[PDB]
């Protein structure tokens, strides 16, 4: 499988030698996904899993990498007989895709913890017979490239992975599992999930990778974690350098989450002469607006998290309001629980702890406080509005009374004189228009000096009665 020109950089003796290999592969007609994943997995294993004996960098010798490569290509070519699945037109068939998915599936250990770190790469698949959920999808695409199936590509939402293939690349197939205790759909299209307007399938506004974006995925999949307290500096540096190489070649243009990841890495350790983290977070949002109909949630959660860490309360609230403005046009469905958890934590933990500190700082005489800024109160209201609108039409409810005490407490962090300055207008000063029926009914409770806690709870939830006695 490996061509002479792919071998000349070995041995890889440094981070920068790995970067050179990626640059060389990205300059070829198609970068070799199997080679590149094996190399990343090898160095991650010796930098994060087992650092015994490490003195600088785990040298990657050609003999070792080539033998791993051979183990993979042998196991795919032996198990998938292409003659059984004739290809017209440089297009693969659904049966062929399912066969490759079965080969990868059936290779995995019978029982293992699927949520472990460092089981994402082909190095893990060969040496441990273990892959995580999205790692199975990647492995299917790398197997298909090894078989010459140029039309098979990785598809990505914000929480799941599958493949596209076939005439004009228009077919979809499930090739891995999603979540825990969901029923397998391997072999099926993603059309039911698109049609139901779930977050999981992004209303069809998901990423369809080319081979360069598949390289970007494996780079984002690097896991620098050594343990709960400690990251590998070496792997952070490697990931950051590889993402800049991809950025410079144009291959992050259509990958919002990769742009957020790079921004996070720049915040941790800035690269001289590169854009600031904010610039990169805003490029991620621009990418989602340009290529994905502004239907992605995480570009705004990346931005909000940066503002939250920097105790920019105003801009954090604005970014979470913008997050909610995206979610409002989805239906909350059965496998969307990750984004539910993201909204729950923001509403019921992160915002409360931000406003509590702001309240203490205001007591100590801070000026320009978010708590005295009616535009900040309007952002809080717009955040709840989008969550309430999300719930409308959904097959499963979102809000419950466990949300209501936090809402009442957060509203209460703003004095009545501040809250009074927002004008809520119906379809001077801040003006806000509510989309959700729940918030429209809430409007007259929002300006009293002391909020009517009980009334708020009734309005936010399905509860319509108070206690009998």
């Amino acid at each position: 499988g490996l061509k002479a020109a792919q071998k000349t950089l070995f041995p890889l003796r440094s981070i920068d030698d790995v970067v050179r290999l990626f640059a060389a592969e990205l300059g070829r007609e198609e970068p070799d996904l199997v080679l590149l994943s094996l190399v990343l997995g090898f160095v991650e294993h010796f930098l994060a899993v087992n650092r015994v004996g490490l003195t600088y960098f785990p040298v990657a010798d050609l003999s070792i990498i080539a033998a791993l490569y051979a183990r993979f290509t042998a196991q795919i070519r032996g198990a998938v007989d292409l003659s059984l699945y004739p290809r017209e037109g440089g297009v693969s068939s659904r049966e062929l895709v399912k066969k490759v998915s079965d080969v990868i599936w059936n290779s995995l250990s019978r029982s293992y913890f699927k949520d472990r770190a460092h089981i994402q790469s082909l190095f893990s698949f060969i040496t441990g017979t273990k892959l995580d959920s999205s790692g199975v999808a990647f492995a299917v695409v790398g197997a298909c490239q090894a078989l010459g199936l140029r039309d098979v590509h990785l598809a990505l939402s914000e929480d799941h992975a599958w493949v596209v293939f076939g005439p004009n690349g228009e077919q979809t197939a499930e090739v891995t599992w999603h979540g825990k205790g969901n029923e397998d759909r391997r072999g099926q299209t993603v059309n039911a999930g698109v049609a139901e307007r779930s977050w999981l399938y992004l209303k069809g506004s998901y990423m369809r990778c080319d081979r360069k974006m598949e390289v970007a995925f494996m780079v984002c999949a690097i896991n620098p974690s050594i343990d709960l307290h400690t990251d590998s500096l070496e792997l952070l540096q490697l990931q950051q350098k590889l993402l800049w190489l991809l950025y410079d070649l144009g291959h992050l243009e259509r990958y919002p989450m990769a742009l957020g990841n790079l921004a996070d890495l720049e915040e941790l350790e800035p690269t001289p002469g590169r854009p600031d983290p904010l610039t990169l977070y805003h490029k991620g949002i621009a990418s989602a607006k340009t290529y994905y109909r502004d239907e992605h949630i995480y570009p705004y959660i990346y931005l909000a998290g940066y503002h939250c860490r920097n105790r920019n309360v105003r801009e954090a609230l604005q970014a979470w309001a913008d997050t909610a403005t995206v979610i409002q046009d989805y239906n909350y469905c059965r496998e969307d629980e990750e984004i539910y958890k993201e909204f729950f934590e923001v509403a019921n933990d992160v915002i409360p702890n931000l406003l509590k500190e702001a309240a203490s700082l205001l007591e100590a005489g801070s000026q320009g406080s978010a708590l005295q800024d009616p535009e900040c109160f309007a952002h809080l209201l717009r955040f709840y509005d989008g969550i309430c609108k999300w719930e409308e039409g959904s097959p499963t409810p979102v809000l419950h009374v466990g949300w209501a005490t936090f809402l009442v407490q957060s509203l209460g962090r703003f004095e009545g004189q501040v809250r009074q300055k927002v004008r809520i207008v119906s379809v001077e000063g801040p003006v806000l228009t509510f989309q959700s029926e729940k918030m429209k009914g809430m409007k007259e409770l929002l300006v009293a000096t002391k909020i009517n806690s009980s009334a708020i709870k009734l309005q936010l939830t399905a509860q319509s009665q108070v206690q009998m006695k």
Partner: peptide, 9 residues
């Protein structure tokens, strides 16, 4: 377990 490039920890 975190989906590649998901924000936050």
């Amino acid at each position: 377990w975190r989906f590649p490039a998901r924000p936050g920890t």
